[PDB]
Write a protein that binds this ligand. Sequence first.
Ligand SMILES: NS(=O)(=O)c1ccccc1
Ligand SMILES: NS(=O)(=O)c1ccccc1
Ligand SMILES: [Zn+2]
Length: 257
Amino acid sequence: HWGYGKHNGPEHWHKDFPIAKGERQSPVDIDTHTAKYDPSLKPLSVSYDQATSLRILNNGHAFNVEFDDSQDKAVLKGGPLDGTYRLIQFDFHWGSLDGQGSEHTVDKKKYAAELHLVHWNTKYGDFGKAVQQPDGLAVLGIFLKVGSAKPGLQKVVDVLDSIKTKGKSADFTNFDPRGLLPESLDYWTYPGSLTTPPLLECVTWIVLKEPISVSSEQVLKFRKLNFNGEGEPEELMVDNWRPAQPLKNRQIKASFK
Ligand SMILES: NS(=O)(=O)c1ccccc1
Ligand SMILES: NS(=O)(=O)c1ccccc1
Ligand SMILES: [Zn+2]
C-alpha cells in the first residue's frame, strides 16, 4: 500500500493512482506575487457553532478528527463556493523538523505543518458521491508555525498518546474546531485535488494566509505517533506531506487586495 516512505511515497503513487500526474493536482506552491486579487469572491463564512466531533483515528498515514455530518451543523460557504459545504473531518500533515511539514508552500516556504478542514458539497448528498464531482469538496487549509502554544490544539495533542499506532481510535466529543483558526480569513483559492490517494480532483482549496502558532512541544507530540500498528517495529509518523505539484493551467486567486 501507499505511504510516505522511499518505497511507497509520493513518487510512487502514480502507478496505482494515475491521476497523480493529472491536470489539477494538489498541493501547489502559492506564488504570492502571481496570485491576483479577485473582486468576484463573496465573503467567506465558516459556521462551526454547532460542530459535533465524534472520534479521533490514527489511520497509519496521519490522524483524522471525525465529525457528525448527518445534519447542517458545521458548514463553509461563500468565497469562491457555490452553495453549502458540510464539515466531515480534519487532518494534519507535519514534518520531522520545524523547517518542513506543510503541503502547500508560500513563495517556496515550507511551514512546520498544515491543517485541513474537509467539507463536502451538500448538493451531492454525501461524501462518497461528492468526491465523484469536480466541485464536490472544499478544503480549508491552515499553516502552522512553531512559536507560542495554540490552546485550542492542546486537547488534540493530549489524546494522541491513546492513538499511538495504526488503526487505534478514541472518543473525541465536544471539541470545538473554531479554536484551530487564525484571526484573519484572508485566503488564496484554486481548484485542486485530495493530497493523498486516491488523489481525486474534486477540491476547491481555500488556503489561509495567516498561519496559526503552535508550540514546539505540541508539534513534538505529533512526531511521537507511529505509522506502524501495535506490536510492530516503530516507524515514527513524520513527513506525511506530499510536495508541491505542477500548477498547469490554473490561476491562484487572492481574497485580499
Ligand atoms: N503506487 S503505490 O500505491 O504508492 C505502491 C507503491 C509500492 C507498493 C505498493 C503500492
Ligand atoms: N489531505 S486532504 O487532501 O485534505 C484529504 C481529505 C479527505 C480524504 C483524503 C485527503
Ligand atoms: Zn490533509
